[PDB]
């Protein structure tokens, strides 16, 4: 059982965009399975994580379908991912021969074949290593400090639901005609103490 209200009221994320569903009404509906994926990108490429966008990130690393449903959450993380002397442990693809299909990955590092003359196992001329390296420094500009991105996806179709919002309850009364809603059971009546003995 999920609880998105705490996340939405955390008031620390600088980007909370939900496509096809409003965040306020996210506590009153059930899903089957929820997919969560995360990565770190620059502060200027954050606008490329959206349905129907172009750029290096959206073309070679992460692609979102045009019928996407879910939410995109991002927040600045300059204090945790950048160190003096530069951080070179974050990479991003920069050369490729075609665009990614929606929700696809590739981690092959075969040498890129630019120009006409072929090559193999060498990076001398017109043959470039695909993956580049982000250079993160704590003194970089606002548009260059790293950001942490988390994307959620839903389906809302088929199967028995398994993840639900936090349905809550209230207190009980007695000897008064009320509107009880015990679990899925509903109706009106006068609840009173009984001496019946149910089986366990």
């Amino acid at each position, epitope marked *: 059982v999920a609880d998105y209200s705490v996340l939405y009221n955390s008031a620390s994320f600088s980007t909370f965009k939900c496509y096809g569903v409003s965040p306020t009404k996210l506590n009153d509906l059930c899903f089957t399975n929820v997919y969560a994926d995360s990565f770190v990108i620059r502060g200027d490429e954050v606008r490329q994580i959206a349905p129907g966008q172009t750029g290096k990130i959206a073309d070679y690393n992460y692609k979102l379908p045009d019928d996407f449903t879910g939410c995109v959450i991002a927040w600045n993380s300059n*204090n*945790l*991912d*950048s*160190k*003096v*002397g*530069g*951080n*070179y*442990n974050y990479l991003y693809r920069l050369f490729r021969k075609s665009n990614l299909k929606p929700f696809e990955r590739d981690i092959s590092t075969e040498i890129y074949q630019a120009g006409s003359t072929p090559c193999n196992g060498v990076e001398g001329f017109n043959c470039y290593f695909p993956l580049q390296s982000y*250079g993160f*420094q*704590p*003194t970089n500009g606002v548009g260059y400090q790293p950001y942490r991105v988390v994307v959620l996806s839903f389906e809302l179709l088929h199967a028995p639901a398994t993840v639900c919002g936090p349905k809550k309850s209230t207190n009980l009364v007695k000897n008064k005609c009320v509107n009880f809603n015990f679990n899925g059971l509903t109706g009106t009546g006068v609840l009173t103490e009984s001496n019946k003995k149910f089986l366990p």
Partner: antibody
Amino acid sequence: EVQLVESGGGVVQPGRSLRLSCAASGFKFSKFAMHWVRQAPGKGPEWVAVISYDGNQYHSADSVKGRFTISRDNSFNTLYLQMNSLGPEDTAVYYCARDGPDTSGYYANIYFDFWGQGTLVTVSS
Amino acid sequence: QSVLTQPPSVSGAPGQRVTISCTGSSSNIGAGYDVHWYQQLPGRAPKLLIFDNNNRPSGVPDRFSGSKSGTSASLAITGLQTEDEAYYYCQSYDNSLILAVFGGGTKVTVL
């Protein structure tokens, strides 16, 4: 073994510029970024500057900014530090340190695992 | 100047235990960054002694241990002998001033 030897210290009058370096050996010099650390006589160590593993990016402490410059030669396994217009409070022992290979949690934590020996630098007349 | 506050000197005698308590502010240690300890024997350059929280490196007796909690850190010497007379410094990182910071150091004395 990872050993570092540095030289270039001496007694100088105020206002003049000096230049000292340390030559490394026993490990791939290109991989590791390296730091400069000074320690006043009888006090705690202090941080000075840092240069990346290719020289494209660098950073310096606020106190010595505008007076201290560091360069790097990846081929000759030496790194250089330039000081201009020495002040009376620049007298200390200067070590060149090596960045830590593995820092476990987080990416901003830094530590020094191998140290040189130090060169006595003093300013007087 | 030492950003991290450290006791000036800790005495002791062979056999028992001694503790060094290095305390920091909210930006340096309270932000979740780790703590490091070196040993500077007299007449020698400082040498790494305890990198990361505890997690001693190669070539050091296990008598030295340390830990961090809250906004301070502590190093413990177990089964102290007479050869530990040296200086010990606590080091960490700061996210506001943006530079590595050192402690004032402690001169451990063995009676």
